[PDB]
């Protein structure tokens, strides 16, 4: 027996507070990515990079914010956008009720071990079966073109696509994702945390909020909550293979302006 009582209304307020904060922190929402990807927007159409000639034109006509290998220039671009995503996700984290009242070293640990899992979550919002929106929607790079880059770069995006295909089938919206990303950030099992109970307490409240959100928003998926928790298990391991691959590249191949200052 679900009920509209003060407890539920507080979970809906928490859900709305997180959604609003999500909208401020991440200008390219899933609703907007979906409008661009499905050509259901009046907005300027993205430039498609589907081969080497289309990439060369792309560097010219997609403006972002040298190295003679195409594959390295692409990977570096991904690494710079990842840095930017860490800033926006930290900004988002600050808006989660209880997060800035935690020991700063724990705040750093939560974000240190979480941002990769959130990047792969939010990347899914920008992907379909054909590829991924780049430069906040000015560009679209195809899955197969990324795959065609010489080793070890050809496989850097594949596991994100594998994850995204199955994650996007759950049809989550920005309201669902905002709560989901907050559950990830407040994970009490990160290594090196001083004070666990206060983190689990916020996560408990976030879990209740997420559960209510998915029940209200997804009438034809009675165990979507259990499905989303299963995806946090996936994500941890995807991040394991990502981290392990970034080792190889850094020590087998020859730095963002914020990382200099």
């Amino acid at each position: 027996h679900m009920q509209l009582n003060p407890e539920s209304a507080d979970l809906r307020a928490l859900a709305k507070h997180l959604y609003d904060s999500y909208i401020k922190s991440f200008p390219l929402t899933k609703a907007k990515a979906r409008a661009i990807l499905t050509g259901k927007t009046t907005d300027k159409s993205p430039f498609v990079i589907y081969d080497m000639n289309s990439l060369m034109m792309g560097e010219d006509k997609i403006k972002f914010k040298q190295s003679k290998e195409v594959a390295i220039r692409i990977f570096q671009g991904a690494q710079f956008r990842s840095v930017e995503a860490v800033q926006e996700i930290t900004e988002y984290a600050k808006s989660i009720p209880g997060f800035v009242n935690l020991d700063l070293n724990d705040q750093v640990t939560l974000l240190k071990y979480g941002v990769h899992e959130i990047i792969y979550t939010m990347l899914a919002s920008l992907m379909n079966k054909d590829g991924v929106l780049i430069s906040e929607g000015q560009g679209f790079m195809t899955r197969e073109f990324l795959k065609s880059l010489r080793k070890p770069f050809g496989d850097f995006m594949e596991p994100k696509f594998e994850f995204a295909v199955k994650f996007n089938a759950l049809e989550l919206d920005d309201s669902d994702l905002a709560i989901f990303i907050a559950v990830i950030i407040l994970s009490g099992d990160r290594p090196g945390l001083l004070n666990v109970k206060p983190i689990e307490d916020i996560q408990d409240n976030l879990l209740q909020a997420l559960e209510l959100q998915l029940k209200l928003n997804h009438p034809e998926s009675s165990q979507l909550f259990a499905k989303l928790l299963q995806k946090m298990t996936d994500l941890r391991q995807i991040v394991t293979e990502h981290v392990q691959l970034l080792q190889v590249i850094k020590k087998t191949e020859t730095l963002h302006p914020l990382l200099q200052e």
Partner: peptide, 11 residues
Amino acid sequence: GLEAIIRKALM
């Protein structure tokens, strides 16, 4: 490195 950006962004 990651910590650098997180620490600055949190302030």
